[PDB]
Tab-separated table of C-alpha atoms (C1' of nucleotides) and ligand atoms in Angstrom:
chain	number	residue	atom	x	y	z
A	197	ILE	CA	-4.531	-1.277	-10.901
A	198	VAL	CA	-4.088	0.049	-14.273
A	199	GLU	CA	-1.965	3.529	-14.304
A	200	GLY	CA	-2.024	4.042	-9.974
A	201	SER	CA	0.627	4.024	-8.142
A	202	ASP	CA	2.087	2.436	-5.096
A	203	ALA	CA	1.050	3.612	-1.959
A	204	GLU	CA	1.019	4.764	1.635
A	205	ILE	CA	1.383	2.776	4.492
A	206	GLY	CA	-2.277	2.514	6.459
A	207	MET	CA	-3.030	4.617	3.587
A	208	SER	CA	-6.060	2.640	3.216
A	209	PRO	CA	-6.366	0.410	6.356
A	210	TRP	CA	-9.997	-1.575	5.709
A	211	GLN	CA	-7.899	-3.020	2.345
A	212	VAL	CA	-8.346	-7.187	2.974
A	213	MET	CA	-6.682	-9.850	0.774
A	214	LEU	CA	-8.718	-12.808	-0.111
A	215	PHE	CA	-6.638	-15.191	-0.086
A	216	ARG	CA	-7.071	-19.315	-1.343
A	217	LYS	CA	-5.242	-21.928	1.004
A	218	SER	CA	-4.328	-24.358	-1.283
A	219	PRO	CA	-2.966	-24.098	-3.824
A	220	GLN	CA	-1.407	-20.491	-2.325
A	221	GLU	CA	-2.935	-17.066	-5.230
A	222	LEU	CA	-4.247	-14.280	-4.551
A	223	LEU	CA	-8.625	-14.238	-5.029
A	224	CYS	CA	-9.478	-10.560	-4.540
A	225	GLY	CA	-10.268	-7.675	-3.043
A	226	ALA	CA	-12.415	-6.358	0.175
A	227	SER	CA	-12.888	-4.523	2.919
A	228	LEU	CA	-13.262	-4.458	6.320
A	229	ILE	CA	-16.673	-1.982	7.778
A	230	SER	CA	-16.577	-4.072	11.604
A	231	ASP	CA	-13.979	-6.047	13.659
A	232	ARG	CA	-16.048	-9.379	12.042
A	233	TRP	CA	-17.622	-8.329	8.535
A	234	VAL	CA	-15.581	-8.028	5.707
A	235	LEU	CA	-16.946	-6.766	2.485
A	236	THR	CA	-16.213	-8.484	-0.988
A	237	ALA	CA	-17.923	-8.666	-4.287
A	238	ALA	CA	-20.007	-12.301	-4.832
A	239	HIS	CA	-18.136	-12.963	-8.159
A	240	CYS	CA	-14.434	-14.120	-5.956
A	241	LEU	CA	-16.170	-16.786	-4.343
A	242	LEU	CA	-19.396	-18.232	-7.023
A	243	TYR	CA	-18.955	-17.509	-10.076
A	244	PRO	CA	-20.266	-21.010	-12.350
A	245	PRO	CA	-19.488	-19.964	-15.899
A	246	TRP	CA	-16.020	-20.197	-14.287
A	247	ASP	CA	-16.655	-23.307	-12.184
A	248	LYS	CA	-15.505	-20.989	-9.225
A	249	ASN	CA	-17.359	-21.719	-6.001
A	250	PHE	CA	-15.298	-21.303	-3.023
A	251	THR	CA	-16.677	-22.371	0.746
A	252	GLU	CA	-15.685	-21.342	3.597
A	253	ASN	CA	-12.427	-24.181	4.192
A	254	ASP	CA	-11.350	-22.965	1.175
A	255	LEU	CA	-9.863	-19.546	1.857
A	256	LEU	CA	-8.866	-16.575	4.593
A	257	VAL	CA	-8.511	-13.587	4.880
A	258	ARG	CA	-5.721	-11.630	5.050
A	259	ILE	CA	-5.798	-8.070	7.323
A	260	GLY	CA	-3.458	-4.703	7.283
A	261	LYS	CA	-1.066	-5.669	4.367
A	262	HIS	CA	0.711	-3.732	1.849
A	263	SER	CA	3.205	-6.143	-0.067
A	264	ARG	CA	1.146	-8.311	-2.590
A	265	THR	CA	3.504	-11.318	-1.679
A	266	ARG	CA	5.222	-11.230	1.277
A	267	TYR	CA	4.054	-12.005	4.678
A	268	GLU	CA	4.049	-8.972	7.015
A	269	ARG	CA	5.396	-10.137	10.381
A	270	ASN	CA	3.823	-8.611	13.555
A	271	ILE	CA	1.531	-6.638	10.883
A	272	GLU	CA	-0.606	-8.407	8.641
A	273	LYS	CA	-3.098	-10.698	10.309
A	274	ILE	CA	-4.968	-13.169	8.631
A	275	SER	CA	-8.197	-14.378	9.869
A	276	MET	CA	-10.430	-17.402	8.950
A	277	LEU	CA	-14.218	-17.171	7.725
A	278	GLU	CA	-16.648	-18.522	9.687
A	279	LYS	CA	-19.914	-17.557	7.089
A	280	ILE	CA	-20.496	-16.276	3.451
A	281	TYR	CA	-23.544	-14.470	2.337
A	282	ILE	CA	-23.744	-14.435	-1.282
A	283	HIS	CA	-27.013	-11.746	-2.626
A	284	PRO	CA	-30.187	-13.204	-2.698
A	285	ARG	CA	-30.382	-12.040	-5.912
A	286	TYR	CA	-26.782	-11.860	-7.246
A	287	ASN	CA	-27.277	-11.968	-11.189
A	288	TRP	CA	-23.647	-14.660	-12.385
A	289	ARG	CA	-25.904	-15.450	-14.969
A	290	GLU	CA	-25.539	-12.344	-16.696
A	291	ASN	CA	-24.454	-9.239	-15.819
A	292	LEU	CA	-23.289	-9.595	-12.497
A	293	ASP	CA	-25.991	-7.522	-10.923
A	294	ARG	CA	-25.498	-7.506	-7.401
A	295	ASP	CA	-21.739	-7.974	-7.069
A	296	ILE	CA	-21.612	-8.354	-2.738
A	297	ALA	CA	-20.955	-10.455	-0.932
A	298	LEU	CA	-20.216	-10.843	3.315
A	299	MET	CA	-18.475	-12.402	4.586
A	300	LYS	CA	-17.647	-12.854	8.464
A	301	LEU	CA	-15.044	-13.929	10.520
A	302	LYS	CA	-14.266	-16.187	13.082
A	303	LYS	CA	-13.101	-14.196	15.315
A	304	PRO	CA	-13.259	-10.670	16.013
A	305	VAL	CA	-10.125	-8.785	14.619
A	306	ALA	CA	-8.201	-6.191	16.769
A	307	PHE	CA	-7.719	-3.089	14.978
A	308	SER	CA	-4.059	-0.873	14.821
A	309	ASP	CA	-2.700	1.721	13.141
A	310	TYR	CA	-2.961	-0.471	9.375
A	311	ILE	CA	-5.985	-1.971	10.579
A	312	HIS	CA	-8.846	0.251	11.008
A	313	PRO	CA	-12.649	-0.293	9.096
A	314	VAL	CA	-14.037	1.837	7.149
A	315	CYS	CA	-17.596	3.536	7.188
A	316	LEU	CA	-21.349	2.118	5.249
A	317	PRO	CA	-22.322	5.439	3.304
A	318	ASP	CA	-25.582	7.030	4.998
A	319	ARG	CA	-28.372	8.171	2.900
A	320	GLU	CA	-27.475	11.793	2.755
A	321	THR	CA	-23.280	11.079	2.263
A	322	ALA	CA	-24.242	8.852	-1.017
A	323	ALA	CA	-26.945	11.952	-2.206
A	324	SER	CA	-24.150	14.820	-2.055
A	325	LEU	CA	-20.748	12.961	-2.912
A	326	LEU	CA	-22.599	10.332	-6.324
A	327	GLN	CA	-21.998	12.983	-8.670
A	328	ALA	CA	-20.878	12.947	-11.175
A	329	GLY	CA	-17.032	14.262	-11.239
A	330	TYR	CA	-16.800	13.596	-7.885
A	331	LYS	CA	-13.600	11.330	-6.869
A	332	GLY	CA	-13.232	8.610	-5.483
A	333	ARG	CA	-10.400	6.080	-4.317
A	334	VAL	CA	-9.818	2.369	-5.890
A	335	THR	CA	-6.743	0.348	-4.454
A	336	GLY	CA	-6.393	-3.434	-4.870
A	337	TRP	CA	-2.872	-5.878	-5.214
A	338	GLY	CA	-4.619	-6.474	-8.927
A	339	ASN	CA	-3.294	-6.287	-12.567
A	340	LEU	CA	-0.830	-2.630	-13.907
A	341	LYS	CA	-2.354	-4.501	-17.676
A	342	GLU	CA	-4.117	-7.022	-19.455
A	343	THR	CA	-2.252	-10.042	-18.611
A	344	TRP	CA	-4.012	-12.519	-21.226
A	345	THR	CA	-2.682	-10.971	-24.117
A	346	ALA	CA	0.991	-9.772	-24.675
A	347	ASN	CA	1.719	-6.850	-23.433
A	348	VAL	CA	4.946	-4.769	-22.029
A	349	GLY	CA	5.614	-4.228	-18.411
A	350	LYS	CA	5.088	-5.976	-15.348
A	351	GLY	CA	2.013	-7.881	-14.775
A	352	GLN	CA	1.129	-7.222	-11.068
A	353	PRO	CA	2.990	-4.858	-8.591
A	354	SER	CA	4.686	-5.093	-6.086
A	355	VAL	CA	3.323	-3.694	-3.744
A	356	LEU	CA	-0.756	-2.401	-2.772
A	357	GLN	CA	-1.540	0.032	-5.852
A	358	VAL	CA	-4.197	2.858	-5.203
A	359	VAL	CA	-5.505	5.001	-8.207
A	360	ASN	CA	-8.594	7.722	-8.131
A	361	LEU	CA	-11.077	8.216	-10.447
A	362	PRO	CA	-13.997	10.603	-10.959
A	363	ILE	CA	-17.429	9.011	-11.107
A	364	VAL	CA	-18.719	8.789	-15.048
A	365	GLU	CA	-22.589	9.846	-16.367
A	366	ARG	CA	-24.859	7.072	-16.172
A	367	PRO	CA	-26.059	7.456	-19.987
A	368	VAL	CA	-22.235	7.365	-20.803
A	369	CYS	CA	-21.979	4.640	-18.353
A	370	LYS	CA	-24.806	2.979	-20.851
A	371	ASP	CA	-23.156	4.156	-23.933
A	372	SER	CA	-20.271	2.732	-23.518
A	373	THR	CA	-20.640	-0.894	-22.922
A	374	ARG	CA	-23.763	-3.437	-24.857
A	375	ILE	CA	-23.746	-5.155	-21.343
A	376	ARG	CA	-26.607	-4.250	-19.227
A	377	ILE	CA	-26.119	-1.543	-16.823
A	378	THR	CA	-28.409	-1.956	-14.016
A	379	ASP	CA	-29.131	-0.038	-10.583
A	380	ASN	CA	-26.996	-1.308	-8.738
A	381	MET	CA	-23.665	-0.643	-9.846
A	382	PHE	CA	-22.514	2.637	-11.766
A	383	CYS	CA	-18.740	3.345	-13.158
A	384	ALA	CA	-15.648	5.666	-12.920
A	385	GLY	CA	-12.986	6.968	-14.524
A	386	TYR	CA	-12.320	9.939	-17.011
A	387	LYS	CA	-13.044	9.687	-20.233
A	388	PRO	CA	-10.877	9.744	-23.295
A	389	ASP	CA	-10.369	14.082	-24.364
A	390	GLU	CA	-10.066	13.775	-20.474
A	391	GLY	CA	-5.565	14.281	-19.737
A	392	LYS	CA	-5.435	10.946	-16.537
A	393	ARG	CA	-5.719	7.703	-17.303
A	394	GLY	CA	-6.102	4.663	-14.376
A	395	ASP	CA	-9.118	2.311	-13.926
A	396	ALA	CA	-9.364	-1.508	-12.203
A	397	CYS	CA	-8.404	-4.530	-14.060
A	398	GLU	CA	-8.707	-8.765	-12.765
A	399	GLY	CA	-7.863	-9.201	-9.158
A	400	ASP	CA	-8.849	-6.033	-7.862
A	401	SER	CA	-12.701	-7.378	-7.741
A	402	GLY	CA	-14.456	-6.630	-4.189
A	403	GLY	CA	-11.287	-3.892	-3.726
A	404	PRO	CA	-12.516	-1.217	-2.112
A	405	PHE	CA	-14.670	2.124	-3.869
A	406	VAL	CA	-13.797	4.889	-1.182
A	407	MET	CA	-14.864	8.745	-0.525
A	408	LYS	CA	-13.509	11.134	1.585
A	409	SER	CA	-16.270	13.013	3.349
A	410	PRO	CA	-15.781	16.875	3.254
A	411	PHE	CA	-18.270	17.480	6.421
A	412	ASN	CA	-16.384	14.776	9.185
A	413	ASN	CA	-13.638	13.784	6.730
A	414	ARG	CA	-14.995	10.264	7.242
A	415	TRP	CA	-13.853	7.972	3.997
A	416	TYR	CA	-16.557	5.387	2.962
A	417	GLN	CA	-17.477	3.039	0.283
A	418	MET	CA	-18.878	4.305	-2.450
A	419	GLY	CA	-18.781	1.063	-4.244
A	420	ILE	CA	-16.946	-2.321	-4.614
A	421	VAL	CA	-14.881	-3.064	-7.686
A	422	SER	CA	-16.903	-5.330	-9.746
A	423	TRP	CA	-16.419	-5.468	-14.015
A	424	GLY	CA	-14.930	-4.495	-17.228
A	425	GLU	CA	-13.832	-4.412	-20.615
A	426	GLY	CA	-10.333	-5.295	-20.746
A	427	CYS	CA	-8.577	-2.568	-18.030
A	428	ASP	CA	-8.266	1.728	-18.989
A	429	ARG	CA	-9.177	1.015	-22.420
A	430	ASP	CA	-10.299	5.195	-23.935
A	431	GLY	CA	-14.113	5.451	-24.172
A	432	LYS	CA	-15.070	2.277	-20.822
A	433	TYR	CA	-14.995	2.361	-18.332
A	434	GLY	CA	-15.220	0.648	-14.965
A	435	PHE	CA	-17.699	-0.927	-12.629
A	436	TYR	CA	-19.097	-0.681	-9.623
A	437	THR	CA	-21.132	-2.415	-7.242
A	438	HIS	CA	-23.457	0.451	-6.105
A	439	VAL	CA	-22.990	-0.368	-1.875
A	440	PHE	CA	-25.750	2.361	-1.183
A	441	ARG	CA	-28.005	0.955	-2.851
A	442	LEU	CA	-27.850	-2.540	-1.530
A	443	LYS	CA	-27.283	-1.037	1.768
A	444	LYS	CA	-30.619	-2.671	2.893
A	445	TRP	CA	-29.444	-6.363	2.353
A	446	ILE	CA	-25.850	-5.608	4.041
A	447	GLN	CA	-27.907	-4.251	7.364
A	448	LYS	CA	-29.734	-6.735	7.066
A	449	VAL	CA	-27.884	-9.542	7.497
A	450	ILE	CA	-25.041	-7.876	9.564
A	451	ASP	CA	-27.840	-6.793	12.572
A	452	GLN	CA	-29.581	-9.810	12.216
A	453	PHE	CA	-27.816	-11.680	14.871
A	454	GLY	CA	-26.394	-10.041	19.175
B	233	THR	CA	-24.021	-8.094	14.858
B	234	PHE	CA	-21.707	-5.831	13.322
B	235	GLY	CA	-19.845	-5.260	16.219
B	236	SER	CA	-16.654	-3.039	16.855
B	237	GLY	CA	-16.082	-0.355	14.582
B	238	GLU	CA	-18.531	1.988	13.981
B	239	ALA	CA	-18.559	4.296	16.475
B	240	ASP	CA	-14.642	5.412	14.438
B	241	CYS	CA	-15.353	4.176	11.218
B	242	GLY	CA	-13.203	6.019	8.302
B	243	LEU	CA	-10.666	7.339	10.539
B	244	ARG	CA	-7.318	6.982	9.480
B	245	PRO	CA	-4.370	6.027	12.702
B	246	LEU	CA	-2.260	7.306	10.693
B	247	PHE	CA	-3.559	10.216	8.639
B	248	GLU	CA	-6.792	11.596	10.275
B	249	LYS	CA	-5.495	10.607	13.784
B	250	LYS	CA	-2.254	12.303	13.096
B	251	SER	CA	-3.728	15.216	11.769
B	252	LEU	CA	-1.988	14.207	8.308
B	253	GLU	CA	-2.955	14.162	5.149
B	254	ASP	CA	-2.209	12.113	2.414
B	255	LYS	CA	-0.018	13.148	-1.184
B	256	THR	CA	-3.640	12.506	-2.698
B	257	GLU	CA	-6.522	12.779	-0.760
B	258	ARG	CA	-7.279	17.224	-1.587
B	259	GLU	CA	-7.407	15.725	-5.745
B	260	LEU	CA	-11.000	14.790	-4.216
B	261	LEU	CA	-12.002	16.676	-2.187
B	262	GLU	CA	-10.880	19.490	-4.562
B	263	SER	CA	-12.867	17.525	-7.307
B	264	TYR	CA	-16.051	17.328	-5.406
B	265	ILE	CA	-16.832	21.153	-6.511
C	285	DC	C1'	34.176	-3.132	11.882
C	286	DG	C1'	31.365	-1.823	8.588
C	287	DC	C1'	29.831	-3.909	4.649
C	288	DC	C1'	26.799	-7.794	1.930
C	289	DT	C1'	22.840	-9.707	0.364
C	290	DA	C1'	18.613	-13.448	3.560
C	291	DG	C1'	14.949	-17.321	6.318
C	292	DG	C1'	10.953	-18.037	7.803
C	293	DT	C1'	3.750	-18.427	6.923
C	294	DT	C1'	7.955	-13.500	3.402
C	295	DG	C1'	11.895	-9.643	0.319
C	296	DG	C1'	16.286	-7.580	0.068
C	297	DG	C1'	14.618	-2.208	0.796
C	298	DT	C1'	18.499	-3.778	5.057
C	299	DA	C1'	20.143	-6.676	9.383
C	300	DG	C1'	15.301	-2.416	10.514
C	301	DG	C1'	11.919	-1.965	8.084
C	302	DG	C1'	4.878	0.178	8.816
C	303	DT	C1'	7.477	-5.705	12.018
C	304	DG	C1'	11.515	-10.403	16.177
C	305	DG	C1'	16.042	-12.319	15.476
C	306	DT	C1'	18.467	-12.971	13.404
C	307	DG	C1'	24.134	-14.184	9.945
C	308	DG	C1'	28.887	-14.076	6.404
C	309	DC	C1'	32.718	-11.416	3.743
C	310	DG	C1'	36.646	-8.494	4.319
D	760	LIG	C1	-21.305	-24.620	-4.741
D	760	LIG	O1	-20.660	-25.656	-4.298
D	760	LIG	C2	-22.032	-25.622	-2.854
D	760	LIG	C3	-21.472	-26.694	-2.039
D	760	LIG	O2	-20.020	-26.159	-1.461
D	760	LIG	C4	-22.937	-26.447	-3.797
D	760	LIG	O3	-24.020	-27.312	-2.274
D	760	LIG	C5	-25.008	-27.833	-2.583
D	760	LIG	O4	-25.436	-27.284	-3.124
D	760	LIG	C6	-26.056	-28.409	-4.005
D	760	LIG	C7	-27.573	-28.725	-5.194
D	760	LIG	O5	-27.707	-27.765	-5.755
D	760	LIG	C8	-27.135	-29.313	-2.842
D	760	LIG	O6	-27.839	-30.740	-3.230
D	760	LIG	C9	-28.853	-30.857	-2.123
D	760	LIG	O7	-28.753	-31.173	-0.828
D	760	LIG	C10	-30.021	-31.801	-0.179
D	760	LIG	C11	-29.252	-32.081	0.843
D	760	LIG	O8	-29.680	-30.752	2.020
D	760	LIG	C12	-28.184	-31.092	3.319
D	760	LIG	O9	-27.495	-31.912	2.249
D	760	LIG	C13	-26.048	-31.788	3.014
D	760	LIG	C14	-25.800	-33.579	3.474
D	760	LIG	O10	-27.360	-34.206	2.331
D	760	LIG	C15	-26.020	-30.864	4.092
D	760	LIG	O11	-24.379	-31.075	4.940
D	760	LIG	C16	-26.180	-29.649	3.761
D	760	LIG	O12	-26.462	-29.018	5.069
D	760	LIG	C17	-28.203	-29.852	3.449
D	760	LIG	O13	-28.521	-29.724	4.945
D	760	LIG	C18	-29.036	-28.331	4.637
D	760	LIG	O14	-28.434	-27.404	4.100
D	760	LIG	C19	-29.484	-26.515	3.713
D	760	LIG	C20	-28.990	-24.735	3.120
D	760	LIG	O15	-27.870	-24.133	3.638
D	760	LIG	C21	-29.549	-25.513	5.336
D	760	LIG	O16	-30.905	-24.747	5.664
D	760	LIG	C22	-30.975	-23.156	6.834
D	760	LIG	O17	-31.196	-23.465	7.640
D	760	LIG	C23	-31.106	-22.587	9.053
D	760	LIG	C24	-31.359	-22.273	10.342
D	760	LIG	O18	-31.577	-23.604	10.169
D	760	LIG	C25	-31.910	-25.054	10.755
D	760	LIG	C26	-32.465	-23.999	12.569
D	760	LIG	O19	-34.093	-24.906	12.892
D	760	LIG	O20	-31.523	-23.684	12.689
D	760	LIG	C27	-30.432	-25.526	11.371
D	760	LIG	C28	-30.942	-26.293	12.335
D	760	LIG	O21	-29.426	-27.213	12.915
D	760	LIG	C29	-31.093	-27.681	11.733
D	760	LIG	N1	-32.030	-28.541	13.202
D	760	LIG	C30	-32.224	-29.596	13.066
D	760	LIG	C31	-32.206	-30.894	14.523
D	760	LIG	O22	-31.918	-30.585	12.405
D	760	LIG	C32	-32.558	-27.202	11.634
D	760	LIG	C33	-33.481	-28.267	10.727
D	760	LIG	O23	-33.199	-28.921	9.501
D	760	LIG	C34	-34.899	-27.716	9.809
D	760	LIG	O24	-34.711	-26.743	8.813
D	760	LIG	C35	-35.937	-27.354	10.518
D	760	LIG	O25	-36.731	-28.294	11.117
D	760	LIG	O26	-33.159	-26.266	10.695
D	760	LIG	C36	-31.341	-20.915	8.500
D	760	LIG	O27	-33.241	-21.159	7.532
D	760	LIG	C37	-31.183	-21.011	6.695
D	760	LIG	O28	-32.392	-19.635	5.420
D	760	LIG	C38	-30.951	-22.771	5.408
D	760	LIG	O29	-30.797	-22.410	4.303
D	760	LIG	C39	-30.130	-26.660	6.601
D	760	LIG	O30	-28.555	-25.783	7.260
D	760	LIG	C40	-29.897	-27.632	6.217
D	760	LIG	N2	-30.632	-29.151	7.016
D	760	LIG	C41	-30.679	-30.150	7.454
D	760	LIG	C42	-31.344	-30.677	7.821
D	760	LIG	O31	-29.235	-30.350	7.177
D	760	LIG	C43	-31.705	-31.834	-0.563
D	760	LIG	O32	-32.007	-32.620	0.407
D	760	LIG	C44	-31.410	-31.247	-1.953
D	760	LIG	O33	-33.134	-32.304	-2.879
D	760	LIG	C45	-30.313	-31.277	-2.829
D	760	LIG	O34	-29.671	-32.337	-3.591
D	760	LIG	C46	-25.887	-29.406	-1.298
D	760	LIG	O35	-27.487	-30.094	-0.164
D	760	LIG	C47	-25.446	-28.321	-1.351
D	760	LIG	N3	-24.282	-29.320	-0.407
D	760	LIG	C48	-23.059	-28.425	0.754
D	760	LIG	C49	-22.700	-28.980	1.593
D	760	LIG	O36	-23.815	-27.161	1.185
D	760	LIG	C50	-23.813	-24.767	-4.347
D	760	LIG	O37	-24.812	-25.894	-4.739
D	760	LIG	C51	-23.441	-24.363	-5.317
D	760	LIG	N4	-23.629	-23.007	-5.978
D	760	LIG	C52	-23.775	-22.491	-6.709
D	760	LIG	C53	-24.537	-21.554	-7.232
D	760	LIG	O38	-23.602	-23.785	-8.015
D	761	0G6	C1	-13.264	-10.286	-9.685
D	761	0G6	C2	-12.267	-8.974	-10.357
D	761	0G6	O1	-11.474	-8.997	-10.255
D	761	0G6	C3	-13.044	-9.052	-12.700
D	761	0G6	C4	-12.754	-6.898	-12.176
D	761	0G6	C5	-12.123	-6.572	-13.266
D	761	0G6	C6	-12.915	-5.173	-13.647
D	761	0G6	N1	-12.290	-4.940	-14.561
D	761	0G6	C7	-11.994	-2.994	-15.392
D	761	0G6	N2	-11.286	-2.644	-16.012
D	761	0G6	N3	-12.087	-2.323	-13.434
D	761	0G6	N4	-14.261	-8.480	-12.438
D	761	0G6	C8	-14.032	-10.159	-13.864
D	761	0G6	O2	-13.431	-10.439	-14.286
D	761	0G6	C9	-15.567	-9.809	-14.306
D	761	0G6	C10	-16.245	-11.165	-13.171
D	761	0G6	C11	-16.951	-11.858	-14.603
D	761	0G6	C12	-16.254	-11.426	-16.094
D	761	0G6	N5	-15.658	-9.955	-15.978
D	761	0G6	C13	-15.997	-9.157	-16.611
D	761	0G6	O3	-15.205	-7.745	-16.021
D	761	0G6	C14	-15.294	-9.268	-18.002
D	761	0G6	N6	-13.972	-8.872	-18.136
D	761	0G6	C15	-16.699	-8.407	-18.554
D	761	0G6	C16	-18.455	-9.231	-18.005
D	761	0G6	C17	-18.661	-10.258	-18.331
D	761	0G6	C18	-19.657	-10.729	-18.324
D	761	0G6	C19	-20.053	-10.108	-17.149
D	761	0G6	C20	-19.840	-8.389	-16.611
D	761	0G6	C21	-19.075	-7.940	-16.851
D	762	NA	NA1	-11.532	4.644	-19.796
D	763	NA	NA1	13.479	-10.044	7.687
DNA sequence: CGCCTAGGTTGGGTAGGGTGGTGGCG
């Protein structure tokens, strides 16, 4: 997260860390949608152009965390994956259209003050909240700057970062990049002459873009950190998988078996 | 199968359940107008 | 004692913490 701030404890109890067994390294973000289903971005698990193709055994999920590196004893829960389901029409060859994936845990996890699932949006909530100018919140343990080039500052945070960002008009998203935007995506972030800054970055992928419903005080995941060009650049906006437009697929997989 | 959680989803034990606002949620609410 | 900074599937923020049960010093 670029230009964010340290998250409060239990502020985002649905936040999940996608972790690699060997070597030990943080891979991505993800979100808890139930006691056994986790949502993330497909490119975190599968991106051939980069020799990336993790299977269930290669990874494990870490829930209830705050510190990026420490093992938070008697607080965080580490689960293993029973199965990974990547959207069958996930377009990795081109623009990462449908950058979404579900992961089923081997065993259900118990909730707590630090481990709680977020809501998936319904048509009404999606209709009333997915509006330019309306702000959502993005969280993650990703980079604080563009680490691929000499830049001043730390690269990764000690603690989970958070940042509130406004949804951007679709014509603006489209004109900010040469990459082909699809309905299954949306961009968010402040405009150049708009005062504040902020964005997600490498390592935040799979992280949730959530909005709080004024109609029921429930948090809803409207997006998934998918991609961007650079981080927090003027005239550039972070892109997010449009969770509601993929809601159908999500529910077919989740509700498919008893 | 979905499993447990849907009924109580999106309600944070250390916030909504305790009638407590995080330091920035108000900002989101204010943006919705 | 009152401090000091510490391993562990882990830092040092302090010996509790959003969590156990733990030292070594002057
Ligand atoms: C990222 O990296 C991954 C690896 O990590 C890589 O995957 C590899 O891809 C390569 C090339 O693309 C692929 O090569 C192929 O190998 C084929 C051989 O098939 C088998 O290969 C190995 C060993 O030889 C097995 O371990 C595999 O399991 C595979 O066997 C089948 O796999 C398929 C695909 O997932 C399965 O199909 C699903 O079936 C589901 C339901 O299944 C049932 C059922 O009725 O319930 C399961 C039952 O147990 C079974 N019952 C019995 C008694 O057998 C029945 C039954 O088999 C018949 O179906 C009924 O008559 O089926 C469900 O329907 C779902 O929709 C299906 O997807 C299936 O479980 C397995 N079947 C069997 C019989 O084992 C070659 O034939 C082929 O030509 C090709 O060369 C590798 O196989 C693959 N490797 C691995 C380890 O997966 C990816 O390529 C890479 N990804 C990218 C994008 O780069
Ligand atoms: C995997 C995620 O951590 C990461 C998120 C980046 C978000 N950036 C901003 N500014 N919000 N995603 C990526 O790095 C993706 C995956 C592969 C390449 N990529 C990019 O974002 C590229 N920088 C641009 C891009 C290349 C190809 C296809 C789509 C986008
Ligand atoms: Na920007
Ligand atoms: Na300790």
